[PDB]
Amino acid sequence: ACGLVASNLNLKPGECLRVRGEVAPDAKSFVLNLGKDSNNLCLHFNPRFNAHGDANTIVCNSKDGGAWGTEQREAVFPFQPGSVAEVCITFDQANLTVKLPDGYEFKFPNRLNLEAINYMAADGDFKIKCVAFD
Amino acid sequence: ACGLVASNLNLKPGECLRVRGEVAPDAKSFVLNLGKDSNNLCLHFNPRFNAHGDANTIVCNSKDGGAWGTEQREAVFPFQPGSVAEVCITFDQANLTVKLPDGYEFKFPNRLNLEAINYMAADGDFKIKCVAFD
Ligand SMILES: O=C(O)[C@H](O)[C@@H](O)[C@H](O[C@@H]1O[C@H](CO)[C@H](O)[C@H](O)[C@H]1O)[C@H](O)CO
Ligand SMILES: O=C(O)[C@H](O)[C@@H](O)[C@H](O[C@@H]1O[C@H](CO)[C@H](O)[C@H](O)[C@H]1O)[C@H](O)CO
């Protein structure tokens, strides 16, 4: 919405999307959105340092034809304000797999049954430095 | 564009944009477009392997409010079909500096009044593997 927006990614099941960015020193929250377009997101990835009453919590959700799905809250938080963070994402028909710094990872269901990821957007307190496709 | 489209790049003067991609084995042409949007390009970078009657020539141009400017052709063509190529681009108010594989570097005048570069699009026989902001 205000950070980097990319489309025509043509990311296929099995392929690895790597994103490296800078976490603001005064970070409250940042967002990575993945999906078909801005209205159809298979992953809304929202680490909240201190936002919406949440402290040190990753919130995940989907968006289907403009409507948000049910929020899932993760158990882990390997992010520090004022540091460099890398996130790696892959997916298949059933699940997205998100790999985090310090060896953490979680799965989030592929609620939209997407077979290609064509859209990515960053927002909030995260400056993208590098994007790569493996 | 069938290729990657990126917006909100916020590339400022003196900053370096690095693009790595695979050139198709039967490549005829590829395009990197940089500017404000699809109608307003401070750089249209178009290596022609075999297109528009041209052979192994880099064609550069600008686009201003939908109108193509005066074409310039460069003297070197350090691109091989079926290989990986990195291109680095910096800019200031006067010129864009394009650094090519095999060390060659050329300048293309900045014909637009751009404070920052916010838009990038790739097209043709070039598959983007990595984008980095430096
Ligand atoms: O605080 C809550 O539990 C509440 O459900 C909020 O998380 C929620 O906020 C939105 O969640 C979305 C993801 O599900 C996005 O992160 C939005 O940016 C965020 O506003 C509420 O629906 C509104 O406060
Ligand atoms: O052959 C020429 O010299 C002539 O100028 C062609 O290069 C020109 O082609 C267009 O050049 C643009 C950049 O200046 C873009 O690359 C367009 O895609 C391309 O068609 C002629 O207009 C071709 O009819």
Curated annotation (Swiss-Prot), chains A, B:
Lectin that binds beta-galactoside and a wide array of complex carbohydrates. Plays a role in regulating apoptosis, cell proliferation and cell differentiation. Inhibits CD45 protein phosphatase activity and therefore the dephosphorylation of Lyn kinase. Strong inducer of T-cell apoptosis. Plays a negative role in Th17 cell differentiation via activation of the receptor CD69. It is found in: Secreted, Extracellular space, Extracellular matrix; Cytoplasm; Secreted. CDD domains: GLECT (cd00070). SMART domains: Gal-bind_lectin (SM00908), GLECT (SM00276). InterPro entries: ConA-like_dom_sf (IPR013320), Galectin-like (IPR044156), Galectin_CRD (IPR001079). One of its GO terms (biological process) is plasma cell differentiation. Homodimer. Binds LGALS3BP. Interacts with CD2, CD3, CD4, CD6, CD7, CD43, ALCAM and CD45. Interacts with laminin (via poly-N-acetyllactosamine). Interacts with SUSD2. Interacts with cargo receptor TMED10; the interaction mediates the translocation from the cytoplasm into the ERGIC (endoplasmic reticulum-Golgi intermediate compartment) and thereby secretion. Interacts with CD69. The modification Phosphoserine is found at residue 29. The gene is LGALS1. A beta-D-galactoside binds at residues 44-48, 52, 61, 68-71. The modification N6-acetyllysine is found at residues 12, 28, 107, 127. GO terms for cellular component: collagen-containing extracellular matrix; cytoplasm; cytosol; endoplasmic reticulum lumen; extracellular exosome; extracellular region; extracellular space; galectin complex. PANTHER family: GALECTIN (PTHR11346), GALECTIN-1 (PTHR11346:SF97). It comes from Homo sapiens (Human). The modification N6-succinyllysine is found at residue 107. Residues 3-134 form the Galectin domain. It comes from the Eukaryota. Keywords: Acetylation, Apoptosis, Cytoplasm, Extracellular matrix, Lectin, Phosphoprotein, Secreted. One of its GO terms (molecular function) is RNA binding. Expressed in placenta, maternal decidua and fetal membranes. Within placenta, expressed in trophoblasts, stromal cells, villous endothelium, syncytiotrophoblast apical membrane and villous stroma. Within fetal membranes, expressed in amnion, chorioamniotic mesenchyma and chorion (at protein level). Expressed in cardiac, smooth, and skeletal muscle, neurons, thymus, kidney and hematopoietic cells. The modification N-acetylalanine is found at residue 1. This is Galectin-1.
